[PDB]
Design a protein around this ligand. Structure first.
Ligand SMILES: Nc1ncnc2c1ncn2[C@@H]1O[C@H](COP(=O)(O)OP(=O)(O)OP(O)(O)=S)[C@@H](O)[C@H]1O
Ligand SMILES: Nc1ncnc2c1ncn2[C@@H]1O[C@H](COP(=O)(O)OP(=O)(O)O)[C@@H](O)[C@H]1O
Ligand SMILES: Nc1ncnc2c1ncn2[C@@H]1O[C@H](COP(=O)(O)OP(=O)(O)O)[C@@H](O)[C@H]1O
Ligand SMILES: Nc1ncnc2c1ncn2[C@@H]1O[C@H](COP(=O)(O)OP(=O)(O)O)[C@@H](O)[C@H]1O
Ligand SMILES: [Mg+2]
Ligand SMILES: [Mg+2]
Ligand SMILES: [Mg+2]
Lengths: 25, 580, 190, 190
């Protein structure tokens, strides 16, 4: 019997960034 | 909302959405689900190009016209765009802000219905990566309570792998089976679409042409499904009528115009699909005799099987032809196959059965199963026939093949289809199957041992019965027994090779005049009974191509030609002549 | 009937959802399928049809027009396939018992190993049995499963190996078409 | 002539980009080569020097003198390396037959099986031949490609599903370099 082959699974990375505000006056 | 959701009833009033034809059975199931108190979210599951979105979009058309039941009247279908909605968020809460606003609008209108094309996208990654706040989870409680109605569309491949992983979402969405329509249904569908396509291209499609498009496309285009396939060929024909005509040409689209566009889609030379290639088939036997002379009984047999296959008398599911070229070497058993492909203008496939001798070699032809090396590879045999549906298949030295390989061919002859590792059905009923073996030649030439010689006429056939199993021989259409080359036939072979060398050098400007004595000498040395005429190309290369090639670059032979070959009787060697 | 029928036929869903799906869908059918002469009540016959659509096989319509099909099934097969009447009797009688409600309830409709010479009708009666019954034909050529490792193709590869997402051909095919004829040609070669 | 030598010697870009680049490059060089003098006309020998810079090959080899180098191929190898004179001379006559244009063009130009004791310069003639003709040198040791699984690497990597750019080891080298010698060592043990 031929040897088995394993397949890896790569997870993508994406994140959300907050936003600070600066009033003019 | 403002741009993420596009209403289909308002669009239907203007146009755009094509009308539905022959889908009352499928529509009735959807309406029954939409009218349910809970889980009224039908899911259209069907293969690619089977009208997956023609039923959702057409539901709006029916609602505007009024064909739908009274309960479904006053309902609005919304086509959600996940890409547009998800695009431009650039924040954690922008998606939920717009998404919830969409649900708020639908929740307010109890009769509103949502259409989510390609619903499998949200389950994978709707609006979150490296987290768990997905778009599906937001609508899970709403669907369970029947607050909003959602119509989904996803393919079977994207339904078993992506969908059904989150049983919660699958529970809410009912499944409506969609099947590819028949040929009679599609021709009726194209008739309804003719005014839209005709006005767009300002042409007319004959009734005969429409029936030929679906029929020819199915035979020559197997990758795509029939509904979208027929639309592509029909629409493509109108485009040609816009650019090819110079001015005031015929607007009607005849059958001949469809055969050209469909040929390009299949990468064929237009000879097979065209109905004007009968001249080639009528003289195919005579043409092959000039290319490969000898054994006329073997050449005429192929033409008879090919003629019936293209005359409407071919087998319903078996290949065009299965043959076992049982004969000696050097009788052009493989040459007849390569030349046949050129005549029919189809790809040539050659497989060496000597490599497939071990029990584990059969896997390479059909691919390795899941979980083992080679699974990514579809398979040499399966990928070749799938890539080239119209091609010639050659299997040389089949007798040496392992029995596991013979078993694969059993289904090929009877059913015309072979499954691969990935499950793709190799529909190649158009390819002609040819096999070459030298099993019985040994008994024919070799006499029976003993003082008295027995009748060996039937001994050759008996060997094929023991080597090949009865089921394999029964599936074969015919066995072509080749005959040994005669003294006159071999002399013509020498002229054939010299013609290729003569014409190859004639264009260069070097004339070749081979003497008759040299031709006779090359025949004996070049043609061995055990090995056939295979050494002819080798001796011709060493005897003629080697000396002439050297002087071609430098010397008088570069120009002027005037080459005259001769043979001396004192030493029997071949003399060479060169002049300016 | 909805609770009992759902457990016996509907699969991949739990009993509260399964029973409530048949009851809800049955209300829309009786309320919307007949344009006129509607049925105010919902009898057992209606619930059986709804379960049959969800599971693709009926349980009480056997004495309907389909009844006449089972009678001519044996005779029609004899016309298409001559001789070997004993084999047609086995298939037609097995279907009749299953449809009539005398099935095993834990085994298939029938499992018959047709063995004989080449070209005598082994792969014809089966092909002509699906066409007469109007059901999909799950044709599986066992000549491909020559080695033990080929079993993965039938039930898919296990987790953590290539081809895991592909799944099983036999399992997925049967799930798509539960009512069908499963043909394993040349089983000995496997 | 520019198009013939551009595609062969550069071996970096495709045919259409090379011609437009060399033509523009040639005009600029001749336009500013002398401080005061100038040559409105162009010649083959002039543009040949330009290709040498982008190709990083001497102008002599870049010159369209393949016949000259082929004629003195034996004299060049015998002068650059010593020994195996009989073996080197036989190789030159055979290569001339292929470059003459006779025979089937689809077939490969190189059909040579070296066979002798190592350490006598067998490897050196393969690199010297490529250096003289200008073609690249691609060395593929068969000993590494001994395992049955290793054979598959030549056509494609086993786990390279995302990485389809690399492709097979043998195929990528030939694809990138269409004019290069392939040196296979220890082919008997395969
Ligand atoms: N009893 C039969 N009645 C009518 N046609 C038959 C009959 N037996 C064989 N045929 C014809 O021969 C074809 C092949 O018969 P099958 O029964 O399918 O062969 P098979 O038993 O699968 O053969 P193997 O693979 O060699 S064991 C059928 O498709 C019919 O065309
Ligand atoms: N019943 C039908 N009536 C009219 N046109 C149809 C019908 N079914 C399919 N079509 C046409 O065939 C195509 C169907 O594409 P569709 O199945 O929605 O694509 P996809 O599978 O990629 O989502 C469209 O061009 C559509 O107009
Ligand atoms: N009868 C023939 N007519 C023309 N060429 C022939 C004939 N017999 C052999 N040849 C030549 O022999 C060579 C090999 O032909 P091929 O068909 O591969 O042989 P085989 O059937 O013995 O395997 C080719 O050069 C082919 O043209
Ligand atoms: N004919 C020769 N002339 C000069 N040096 C030689 C000769 N034959 C062998 N050698 C020496 O032996 C080496 C053998 O080749 P090398 O590339 O080092 O290893 P390999 O033979 O394993 O490829 C040469 O590089 C050189 O050092
Ligand atoms: Mg679509
Ligand atoms: Mg059979
Ligand atoms: Mg060395």
């Amino acid at each position: 019997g031929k040897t088995n082959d394993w397949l890896d699974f790569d997870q993508l990375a994406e994140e959300k960034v907050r936003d600070a505000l600066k009033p003019p006056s | 909302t403002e741009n993420f959701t596009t209403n289909l009833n308002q669009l239907a009033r203007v146009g755009g959405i094509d009308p539905l034809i022959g889908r009352e059975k499928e529509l009735e199931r959807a309406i029954q689900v939409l009218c349910r108190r809970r889980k009224n979210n039908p899911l259209l599951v069907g293969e690619s190009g089977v009208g997956k979105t023609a039923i959702a979009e057409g539901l709006a058309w029916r609602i505007v016209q009024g064909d739908v039941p009274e309960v479904m009247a006053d309902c609005t279908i919304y086509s959600l765009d996940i890409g547009s909605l998800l695009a431009g968020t650039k924040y954690r809460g922008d998606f939920e802000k717009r998404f919830k606003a969409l649900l708020k609008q639908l929740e307010q209108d109890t009769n509103s219905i949502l259409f989510i094309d390609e619903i499998h996208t949200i389950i994978g990654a709707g609006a979150a990566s490296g987290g768990q706040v997905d778009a599906a989870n937001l609508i899970k409680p709403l669907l369970s309570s029947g607050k909003i109605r959602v119509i989904g569309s996803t393919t079977y491949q994207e339904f078993s792998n992506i969908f059904e992983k989150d049983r919660a979402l699958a529970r809410r969405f009912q499944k409506i089976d969609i099947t590819e329509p028949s040929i009679e249904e599609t021709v009726q569908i194209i008739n309804g679409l003719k005014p839209k396509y005709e006005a767009h291209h300002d042409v007319r499609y004959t009734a005969k042409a429409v029936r030929a498009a679906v029929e020819l496309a199915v035979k020559y285009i197997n990758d795509r499904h029939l509904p979208d396939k027929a639309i592509d060929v029909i629409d493509e024909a109108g485009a040609r009528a816009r650019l090819m005509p110079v001015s005031k040409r015929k607007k009607t689209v005849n059958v001949a115009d469809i055969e050209s566009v469909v040929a390009r889609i299949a990468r064929i030379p237009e000879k097979s699909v065209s109905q004007s290639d009968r001249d080639t088939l009528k003289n195919l036997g005579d043409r092959l005799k000039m290319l490969v002379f000898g054994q006329d009984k073997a050449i005429e047999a192929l033409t008879e099987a090919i003629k019936m296959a293209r005359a409407g008398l071919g087998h319903e599911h078996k290949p065009v032809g299965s043959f076992l070229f049982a004969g000696p070497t050097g009788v052009g058993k493989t040459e007849v196959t390569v030349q046949l492909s050129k005549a029919l203008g189809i790809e040539l496939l050659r497989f060496d059965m000597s490599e497939y001798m071990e029990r584990h070699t059969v896997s390479r032809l059909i691919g390795a199963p899941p979980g083992y090396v080679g699974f990514d590879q579809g398979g040499l045999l399966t990928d070749a026939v799938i890539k080239h549906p119209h091609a010639v298949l050659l299997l040389d030295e089949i007798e040496k093949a392992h029995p596991d390989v013979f078993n694969i061919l059993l289904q090929v002859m009877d059913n015309g289809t072979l499954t691969d590792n990935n499950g793709r059905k190799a529909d190649f009923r158009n390819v002609v199957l040819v096999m070459t073996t030298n099993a019985g030649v040994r008994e024919t030439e070799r006499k029976s041992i003993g003082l008295i010689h027995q009748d060996n006429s039937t001994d050759a056939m008996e060997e094929i019965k023991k080597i090949f199993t009865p089921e394999f021989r029964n599936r074969l259409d015919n066995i072509i027994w080749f005959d040994h080359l005669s003294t006159d036939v071999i002399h013509q072979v020498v002229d054939k090779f010299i013609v290729e060398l003569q014409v190859q050098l004639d264009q260069k400007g070097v004339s070749l005049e081979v003497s008759q004595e040299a031709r006779n000498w090359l025949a004996e040395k070049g043609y061995d009974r055990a090995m056939g005429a295979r050494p002819m190309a080798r001796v011709i290369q060493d005897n003629l191509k080697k000396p002439l090639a050297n002087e071609l670059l430098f010397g008088s032979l570069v120009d002027g030609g005037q080459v005259t070959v001769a043979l001396d009787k004192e030493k029997n060697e071949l003399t060479y002549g060169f002049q300016s």
